């Protein structure tokens, strides 16, 4: 047993709901539909480096907000991307689906994409020190009061698997009002599986 993630604890304090709707008699059905939608959109845009995707139920209409940090890679020409992204969801769901795409400024601050890039660098055989230090410096120059990154598993050894800590600044997980962005990533290497844990403290709200 160890610490718990802040994503499930900060709800109601500052962070709003990633899903905003009031359902009835179809709660689990809509939840499963949205889970499938998120799985598909993540597997498709895994290369587009999408951080998170919110959904809103609108009385048979679904409004989806996507934070990608790179518009030209998720909308591109505008037409082909929007078609391929909306008609697929429409056909796989059964009703209208509206998509909205926001761009994350300072893309080096969101834990999701940070862990994604770290896992990509690891899968590229980059040393677990160089990649971690470079990502930490990138985040710190982008602007963050605190950054914590942990990698556990086989970092080149076979008999033993150990963790590594590298963090600068203040990461007060116990402070309720912290707006800490948390996300995890996995990296399947030839020697086994590696897990990346990243929770970034962006700032507190008075």
């Amino acid at each position: 047993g160890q610490k718990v993630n802040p994503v499930g604890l900060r709800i109601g304090v500052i962070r709003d709901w990633e899903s905003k709707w009031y359902a009835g008699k179809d709660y689990a059905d809509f939840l499963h539909e949205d889970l499938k939608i998120r799985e598909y959109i993540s597997k498709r845009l895994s290369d587009a480096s999408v951080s998170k995707v919110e959904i809103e139920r609108a009385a048979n209409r679904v409004n989806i907000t996507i934070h990608t940090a790179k518009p030209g890679m998720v909308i591109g020409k505008g037409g082909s991307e929007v078609e391929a992204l909306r008609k697929a969801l429409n056909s796989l769901t059964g009703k209208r689906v509206h998509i909205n795409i926001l761009e994350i400024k300072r893309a080096d601050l969101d834990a999701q994409l940070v862990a994604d890039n770290i896992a990509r660098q690891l899968e590229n055989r980059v040393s677990f020190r160089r990649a971690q230090k470079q990502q930490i410096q990138r985040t710190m120059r982008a602007g963050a009061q605190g950054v914590k990154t942990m990698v556990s598993g086989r970092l080149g050894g076979a008999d033993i698997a150990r963790s590594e800590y590298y963090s600068e600044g203040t990461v007060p997980l116990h402070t309720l009002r912290a707006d800490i962005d948390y996300a995890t990533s996995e990296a399947d290497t030839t020697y086994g599986k590696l897990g990346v844990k990243v929770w970034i403290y962006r700032g507190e709200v008075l």
Binding site: G8, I11, E18, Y27
Partner: protein, 60 residues
């Protein structure tokens, strides 16, 4: 024997009485949830990930 068990769950049972419940995400019987139809660990992680608008941390 996990996806085989999922296909068996999805099979049309002879009698409706023969039907059993599965969380629709993994192959974990033994305390699947009804209200959410999601597995224990799956439901926990998803609620922690901001989904499930209704469920939040409880205190009393």
């Amino acid at each position: 024997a996990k996806k085989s068990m999922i296909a068996k769950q999805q099979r049309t049972p002879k009698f409706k009485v023969q039907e059993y419940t599965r969380c629709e995400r993994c192959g974990r019987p033994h305390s699947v949830i009804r209200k959410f139809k999601l597995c224990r660990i799956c439901f926990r992680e998803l609620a922690y990930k901001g989904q499930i608008p209704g469920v939040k941390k409880a205190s009393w």
